[PDB]
Amino acid sequence: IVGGYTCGANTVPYQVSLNSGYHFCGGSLINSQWVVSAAHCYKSGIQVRLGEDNINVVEGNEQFISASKSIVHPSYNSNTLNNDIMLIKLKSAASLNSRVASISLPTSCASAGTQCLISGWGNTKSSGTSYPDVLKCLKAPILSDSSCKSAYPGQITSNMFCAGYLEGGKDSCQGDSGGPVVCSGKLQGIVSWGSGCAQKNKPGVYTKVCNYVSWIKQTIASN
Numbered sequence: 421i422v423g424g425y426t427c428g429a430n431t432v433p434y435q436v437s438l439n440s441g442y443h444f445c446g447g448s449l450i451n452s453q454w455v456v457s458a459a460h461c462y463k464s465g466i467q468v469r470l471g472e473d474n475i476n477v478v479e480g481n482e483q484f485i486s487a488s489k490s491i492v493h494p495s496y497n498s499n500t501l502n503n504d505i506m507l508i509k510l511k512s513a514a515s516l517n518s519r520v521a522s523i524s525l526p527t528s529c530a531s532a533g534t535q536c537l538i539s540g541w542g543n544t545k546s547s548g549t550s551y552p553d554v555l556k557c558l559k560a561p562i563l564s565d566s567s568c569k570s571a572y573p574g575q576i577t578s579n580m581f582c583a584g585y586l587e588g589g590k591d592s593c594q595g596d597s598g599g600p601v602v603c604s605g606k607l608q609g610i611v612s613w614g615s616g617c618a619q620k621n622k623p624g625v626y627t628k629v630c631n632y633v634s635w636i637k638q639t640i641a642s643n
């Protein structure tokens with residue numbers, strides 16, 4: 421997250437860190453047994469870490485649970501990143517408490533202008549590399565699809581939306597991938613891609629979760 425602030429320990433209780441010997445992507449807990457992340461974060465051998473703040477220090481509120489199954493969207497296209505979403509089932513249900521909680525799926529899509537909260541442990545430098553150990557947060561609004569499409573001609577589909585600032589300075593980045601974009605208490609996006617991080621007229625692009633609620637519900641109830 422570039423140009424953001426330290427969230428505060430466990431102030432984003434649905435944020436998950438996906439680990440394969442190191443943190444490589446974020447995710448969101450949707451219920452005690454399931455996590456939604458991005459399909460471009462797919463890997464075999466994932467351990468989900470809940471209740472994290474510093475990912476290098478066991479501070480006492482963590483739960484490390486291995487994934488039993490991953491399901492990448494049936495129509496995910498790794499070249500265009502269209503339908504960039506994946507579900508991960510936990511081997512054991514997590515214990516929900518103040519520090520570990522799930523986030524609600526949306527009942528409708530959000531409007532351009534809505535302010536959201538994006539979080540993660542990804543890179544914090546636009547022109548450089550600095551990976552933080554504690555969770556960073558960023559408040560950013562959903563942008564109009566026209567400013568999104570003018571920034572990425574022929575690359576945006578109906579399953580994507582842009583959020584951020586066109587002036588640059590604030591954006592999600594590598595390492596934030598798969599993490600949450602929450603607006604009005606609902607998970608509306610998943611960190612997916614962008615051009616570099618925090619560059620002018622290159623906002624971040626997010627998977628439009630309101631388009632996959634039926635697929636999510638149907639898939640977790642049958643697995």
Ligand SMILES: NC(=[NH2+])c1ccc2nc(C(=O)c3nc4ccc(C(N)=[NH2+])cc4[nH]3)[nH]c2c1
Binds near residue numbers: 444460612
């Ligand atoms: N398993 C891997 N090797 C891997 C995993 C995630 C990656 N992600 C990128 C990436 O290139 C990438 N992930 C991004 C997320 C947000 C933004 C943004 N500017 N908002 C830009 C991003 N670029 N390469 C990746 C490689």
Ligand SMILES: [Ca+2]
Binds near residue numbers: 472475476478479
């Ligand atoms: Ca920790």
Ligand SMILES: [Mg+2]
Binds near residue numbers: 445541595597
């Ligand atoms: Mg994240």
Ligand SMILES: [Zn+2]
Binds near residue numbers: 460612613
């Ligand atoms: Zn990524």
